[PDB]
Amino acid sequence: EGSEALLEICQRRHFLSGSKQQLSRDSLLSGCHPGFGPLGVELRKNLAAEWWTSVVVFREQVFPVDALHHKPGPLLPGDSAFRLVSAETLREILQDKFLENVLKTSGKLRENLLHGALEHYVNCLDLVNKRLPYGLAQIGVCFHPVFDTKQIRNGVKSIGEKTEASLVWFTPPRTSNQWLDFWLRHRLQWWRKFAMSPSNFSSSDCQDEEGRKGNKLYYNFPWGKELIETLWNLGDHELLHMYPGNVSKLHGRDGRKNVVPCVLSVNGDLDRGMLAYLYDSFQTRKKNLHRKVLKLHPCLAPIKVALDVGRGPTLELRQVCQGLFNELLENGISVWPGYLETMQSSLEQLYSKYDEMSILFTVLVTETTLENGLIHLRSRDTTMKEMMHISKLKDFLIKYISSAKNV
């Protein structure tokens, strides 16, 4: 009814998502989609960059860490869901004699990346001189099992992919509560940033079966609230579990006292958040506006400005775009390279195409640009066109983006 169905058109169509005619919300939410389009990849990259800048940059005592996509083979208790079947049907044991069937002593793909961070804690303690309050951040893909729950329609469990960004913060036990509240507030504000309707990013409190507390952040999709980020206060249970040999090596210095740190893990789903921002950017009844457009935030839109030409008496003078394009390519302003299709596309269709692609500004070079150069600049937020001058464009765009970065 125009919500979550008219948006998917102009997504796979504008290559913000992998185009196969999926048209499944559950597939996107589960991570079984074929993939993201180049615009979707750029949007996810921008979102990851913003997360990195806000979490580990502008924040001392936070450092990067890499966790492998797979874990070692042996010393791996537990087993997969479908591998745990021995009820019946043992007629054929014709095979002579790791191998076997009890988990085969085989490695596993990582479901969460906090295990790698917890492993890396001891090595990452020397760079802070054992100062307790400090974090390890990482963005990486996580592999999860998912199924339709229809008999065995797909047979083996389907495998879903989700780009998770995790920060594992080691804090003194005494200061755990206020640090948890501060991280919850900061993450909620960050999510509410870049949002046309920040109220849709809600938060709630939850408790573990061990009594540990945490918070859950949700985005209000048109069908209902969906989880995006989870903060948990592990309380050094797993950190001590993985190091049972001795605690002297594990003691870090807080203030003037040696203590075992408490662990707080905050894990957010970048793909679900990217879908949430896509939904938020799009707008219903008796609006009297029309004009479909993705009003993504300038700080994370995939393409900033679109270059074009029009009514050019000389296409040899189209070289004016070149260099200017290069001028925008310096200092990291991404540009949609137009003025190349050489098609009889009216201005209205081009404007609609750029609006649906979340392009902030449309720059048009006309015949009156060779003398006293003026380039028609149209804005995505409001459909009005300026004149401006060539030499001031780059700084202006920078200033615009800079002004969008903060307030």
Partner: protein, 919 residues
């Protein structure tokens, strides 16, 4: 017992002469109006052992208690009254500390003044915060000066307790202090922020000025104006406007006090104070002298106008309030300000988005048909394989250069041509004034924001054409109230709201968002949220100035008592502080205390950012707040006054009958049961009922009913006379307000026009300016409000003196009374906290009985002889089991759950060893 329900008593004579005629009149009056036959549910009998009373009555008991409390300070006041003032010193000293100026201007440095009585004044410079800068005091011995030690150039950055002055001797006994706005001075005296009580008490000449010939709020507009409009003008020669100069001129015969024109204190720097040390010191000494003169002239007037000693003891006890915070106050102020900022940004972002979306209707002149934005401008003004091309021009075709113009680009000559005119006005200049993208400079206060958001009522032309938001806004030239708009406006009409701005018309759209024809509509995404954000924000928006900048003093570790040690909550990097409410003991026409940010009717309410202000009053470890709210104070007072005018038994006038028998739940009480059924609105009737016992008039009732919902004048209080026909049946004649209905308010009028003190309980006098004898006037409503509020403040004083007496009788570590809108809270040590509750209940036994002792009464109903409950908490809040909105939850703060007690407290005794539990 029995007799339609009375209490059990251990004091008072037998007596019991109800009178056959009086009982018959009461019965035959009760047959009509409320029902007579009602067995009801008698309450359990309570047997208690009150402590020994003094005198032949309880009136003499309270008199003796008041004299005992007030003698050590009355002697000091008398000493100041007859003291002889030596001449002012010629030159004021500059040395740090306290300097005494003996005769011939002999300056001697001393540690502290050893004086039993003085007039104090402290001045502050706002540049370096609120720290005091200079002080001058006088005493029967000589003069004293204090330079605040600010002469040194040292950085402290606030957060200190040694900054204020010192006036309490260690005595290793009375310490009366007088002044004008003495609460502000005592904020800069030190040792008043200690958790321990002190024997120093403060008197504020403003509270003797409000009590003696005070000025009404309505009368203030005519008093300033002359520094059916016919009225007498005989009252302007006896009243002032509470300013020091005017009060001194009225009460003391002398030249007008000059005012310093530079006003370096409010706008200046410490260098200016150093340069202007002498003149500012002289001005401060002049103010102190003026205050001393007013106090001397008013003290015998104060005693004469309040012959009963209890009033002075009550003011003495009221003047010492205490509000600990314990490091959460400044933390509470940062979170509130942050939330305010984010909501302002979010609502600001919504308005900019609405403005951007509003640009689309110019694409085809679609704004002409828009009911919302039809009248705006929308006026747009025009007025080597790769080396060959790797570099090329290399500077974006540098051959292009700026030819002509070079003026429009800078500043705003050709500010954004092509855009709408209004959008152009909104946007800032392109580069210079810290350019921010979008239609910034847009805020709630501009005339265009309603045109972009709300636009409800079928119209919302929020224009300033002498009418504000225009509209007939009701059924029945063309397009006067039609939905599409595009009105011709051939002849303007202010229909519907005929009053225009004549009414007070204040804060009426905040509750009209909930239904009330106040919403955005067609947007559906960002319109309503802006209104909802404004609803959350409005309180803090105009309260953050007062709530912030509250003078908090953090005590040092050494000054903490032994209560803090031995407790688990000790030294968690904890900063313990106290807020002095800076409350005038009497700041209105009556003796009711006035405070704009602590004595207001507000509590922790949802969807409000700045709510829960009363919370975060965290007691220190080893102490807790024991408090109680008086159940139906003024309603019961008016009912018992009417009963006393009517007969002896309380169930006689038929108003007290509903007050006593009626209950909130399954009862026809006047609050939310009777008046709501008679009226329309629900839960607003508890304001309409108070608006008749406080003595309003029919026009005010009609206006108040109008603010509840939208109705025409015929259904206002002009033809709908059912409330005024019943209840206060006024203008009763041919009977010699008097009689003919269930409420007896004629006693209040008789009190007002009697020329007595006109306080039926303790005999405190009325302001000279409002007396009919001094000036005949038709301000009956103000006078009846005066008497009922007088009874209220007379009731508060009685509780205060009783609680003080009960605390000083035994070894109870409970003091620091705090009075907020008929709710008394005290800070008491945990080890005796239950006892602190018990006494409070007993207080209501005597206080009510005192109201039942005068005016020829000797009995009281059983139910009203005790409080409903006593709240024993660790923080201040309306109810024990409440939460907060803006924070995550009350668990974020250190707010545990108390115990309202009730009947549990009554099992103990007032001795130190209760039921063997202690020791």
């Amino acid at each position: 017992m029995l007799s339609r329900g009375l209490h059990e008593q251990i004091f008072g004579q037998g007596g019991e002469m109800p009178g056959e005629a009086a009982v018959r009149r009461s019965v035959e009056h009760l047959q009509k109006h409320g029902l007579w036959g009602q067995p009801a549910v008698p309450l359990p009998d309570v047997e208690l052992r009150l402590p020994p009373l003094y005198g032949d009555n309880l009136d003499q008991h309270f008199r003796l208690l008041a004299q005992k409390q007030s003698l050590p300070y009355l002697e000091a006041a008398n000493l100041l009254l007859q003291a002889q003032l030596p001449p002012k010193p010629p030159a004021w000293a500059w040395a740090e500390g306290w300097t005494r100026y003996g005769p011939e201007g002999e300056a001697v440095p001393v540690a502290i003044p050893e004086e039993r009585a003085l007039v104090f004044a402290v001045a502050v410079c706002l540049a370096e915060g609120t720290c005091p800068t200079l002080a001058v005091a006088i005493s029967p011995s000589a003069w004293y000066s204090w330079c605040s030690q600010r002469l040194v150039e040292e950085r402290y950055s606030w957060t200190s307790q040694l900054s204020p002055a010192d006036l309490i001797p260690l005595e290793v006994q009375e310490q009366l202090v007088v002044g004008h706005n003495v609460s502000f001075d005592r904020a800069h005296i030190r040792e008043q922020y200690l958790i321990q009580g002190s024997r120093m008490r403060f008197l504020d000449t403003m509270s003797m000025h409000m009590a003696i010939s005070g000025l009404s709020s309505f009368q203030r507009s005519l008093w300033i104006a002359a520094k059916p409009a016919i009225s007498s003008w005989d009252w302007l020669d006896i009243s002032s406007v509470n300013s020091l100069a005017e009060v001194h001129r009225l009460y003391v015969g002398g030249p007008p006090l000059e005012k310093e024109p530079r006003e370096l204190f409010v706008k200046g720097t410490m260098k200016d104070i150093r340069e202007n040390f002498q003149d500012l010191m002289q001005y401060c000494a002049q103010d102190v002298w003026a205050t001393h003169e007013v106090f001397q002239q008013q003290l015998p007037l104060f005693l004469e106008r309040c012959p009963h000693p209890v009033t002075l003891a009550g003011m003495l006890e009221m003047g010492v309030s205490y509000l600990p915070v314990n490091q959460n106050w400044e933390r509470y102020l940062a979170e509130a300000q942050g939330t305010y900022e984010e909501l302002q940004r979010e609502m600001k972002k919504s308005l900019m988005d609405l403005a951007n979306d509003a640009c689309q209707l110019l694409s085809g002149e679609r704004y002409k048909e828009d009911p919302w934005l039809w009248d705006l401008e929308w006026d747009l003004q025009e007025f080597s394989e790769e080396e060959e091309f790797q570099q090329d021009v290399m500077a974006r075709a540098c051959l292009q250069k700026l030819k002509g113009t070079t003026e429009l680009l800078p500043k705003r000559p050709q500010h954004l041509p092509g855009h709408p005119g209004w959008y152009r006005k909104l946007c800032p200049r392109l580069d210079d004034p810290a350019w921010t993208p979008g239609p910034s400079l847009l805020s709630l206060q501009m005339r265009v924001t309603p045109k972009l958001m709300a636009l409800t009522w079928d119209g919302f032309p929020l224009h300033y054409s002498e009418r504000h938001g225009w509209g007939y806004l009701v059924p029945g030239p063309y397009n006067d109230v039609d939905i599409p708009g595009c009105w011709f406006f051939k002849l303007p009409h202010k229909d519907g709201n005929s009053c225009n701005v004549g009414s007070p018309f204040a804060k009426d759209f905040l509750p009209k968002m909930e239904d009330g024809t106040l919403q955005a509509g067609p947007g559906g995404a960002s319109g309503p949220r802006a209104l909802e954000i404004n609803k959350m924000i409005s309180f803090w928006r105009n309260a953050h100035k007062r709530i912030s900048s509250q003078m908090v003093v953090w005590l040092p570790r050494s000054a903490l008592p032994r209560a803090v040690i031995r407790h688990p909550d000790y030294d968690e990097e904890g900063l313990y502080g106290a807020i002095l409410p800076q409350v005038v003991t009497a700041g209105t026409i009556t003796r009711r205390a006035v405070e704009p940010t602590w004595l207001t009717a507000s509590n922790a309410r949802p969807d409000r950012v700045g709510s829960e202000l009363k919370a975060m009053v965290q007691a220190p470890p080893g102490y807790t707040l024991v408090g109680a709210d008086v159940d139906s104070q003024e309603l019961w007072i008016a009912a018992v006054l009417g009963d006393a005018h009517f007969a002896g038994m309380h169930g006689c006038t038929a108003f007290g009958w509903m007050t006593l028998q009626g209950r909130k739940s399954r009862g026809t009480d006047l609050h939310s049961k009777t008046a709501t059924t008679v009226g329309i609105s629900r839960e607003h009737a508890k304001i309409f009922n108070y608006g008749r016992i406080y003595g309003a008039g029919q026009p005010f009732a009609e206006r108040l009913l109008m603010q509840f919902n939208h109705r025409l004048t015929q259904q206002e209080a002009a033809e709908k006379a059912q409330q005024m026909y019943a209840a206060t049946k006024g203008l009763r004649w041919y009977r010699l307000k008097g009689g003919t209905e269930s409420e007896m308010f004629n006693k209040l009028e008789s009190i007002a026009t009697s020329d007595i003190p006109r306080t039926p309980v303790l005999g405190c006098c009325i302001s000279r300016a409002l007396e009919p004898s001094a000036v005949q006037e038709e301000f009956m409503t103000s006078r009846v409000n005066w008497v009922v509020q007088s009874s209220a403040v007379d009731y508060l004083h009685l509780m205060l003196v009783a609680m003080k007496w009960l605390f000083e009788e035994f070894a109870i570590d409970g003091r620091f009374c705090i009075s907020i809108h008929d709710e008394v809270r005290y800070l008491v040590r945990e080890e005796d906290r239950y006892r602190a509750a018990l006494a409070l209940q007993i207080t209501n036994l005597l206080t009510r009985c005192m109201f039942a002792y005068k005016l020829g009464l000797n009995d009281l109903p059983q139910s009203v002889a005790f409080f409903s409950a006593v709240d024993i908490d660790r923080c201040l809040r309306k109810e024990v089991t409440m939460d907060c909105k803006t924070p995550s939850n009350p668990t974020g703060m250190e707010r545990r759950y108390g115990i309202p007690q009730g009947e549990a407290l009554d099992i103990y005794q007032i001795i130190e060893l209760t039921k063997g539990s202690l020791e």
